[PDB]
């Protein structure tokens, strides 16, 4: 018919979907350094996904990993272990003064 | 009292191109003032109230 007519296909300019900082990585309850990055320094409260930026799947793995690590003797509950206070701050929460 | 004249002829065609606004005299003035402001751009108290 006509060579210049549009052709059916999938979007070639489509961009990849977004990924959380932990997409594709195993979350172990023994990796307390990673888990501590998602709890409050002062109170030990687990951050919601709106602060951590994690997706539903990793938000759940982190939560379950934290709860497992806490009661098995790997992680404190009421505060962030001070050893991990100087790790990369990946959470959208501003506290001090 | 001053009476506004008929605004259309025998054929029924209004004289002014803004007749159907209902405010042809007011909107004709706004059109003349707005047009002057345009031409300026292309080119570029005590005793009065």
């Amino acid at each position: 018919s006509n060579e210049d007519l549009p052709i059916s296909m999938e979007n070639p300019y489509k961009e990849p979907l977004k990924k959380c900082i932990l997409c594709g990585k195993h979350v172990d309850y023994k990796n307390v350094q990673l888990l501590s990055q998602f709890v409050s320094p002062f109170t030990g409260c687990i951050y919601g996904r709106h602060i951590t930026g994690l997706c539903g799947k990793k938000q759940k793995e982190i939560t379950k990993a934290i709860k497992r690590a806490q009661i098995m003797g790997f992680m404190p509950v009421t505060y962030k272990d001070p050893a991990y206070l100087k790790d990369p701050k990946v959470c959208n929460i501003r506290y001090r003064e | 009292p001053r009476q506004r004249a008929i605004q259309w002829g025998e054929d029924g065609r209004p004289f002014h191109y803004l007749f159907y606004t209902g405010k042809q005299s007011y909107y004709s003035l706004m059109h003349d003032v707005y047009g002057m402001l345009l031409n300026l751009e292309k080119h570029q108290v005590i005793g009065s109230r």
Partner: protein, 86 residues
């Protein structure tokens, strides 16, 4: 009770400014939800009431976030009138 002390919920005072240290601590406990948690725990909230309030709080946040997004989007045109007189 079994944890180490003077780590959790602990703020150091700078230059004797105890008021600013207390405000920082109060801000910390507020942001983590501890103040509201303590207050709601003075009297027992019944499960039917807790679910109703949590549902109301979650829906109000969505509506407020969505109403903020609309106002931000529709404030781009707050600039001066470009066609004044027309």
């Amino acid at each position: 009770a079994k944890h180490l002390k003077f780590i959790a919920r602990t703020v150091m005072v700078q230059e004797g400014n105890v008021e600013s240290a207390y405000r920082t601590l109060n801000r910390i406990l507020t942001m983590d939800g501890l103040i509201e948690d303590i207050k709601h725990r003075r009297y027992y909230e019944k499960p039917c009431r807790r679910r109703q309030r949590e549902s109301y709080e979650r829906c109000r946040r969505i509506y407020n976030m969505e109403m903020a997004r609309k106002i931000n989007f529709l404030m781009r045109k707050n600039r001066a009138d470009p066609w004044q007189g027309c």
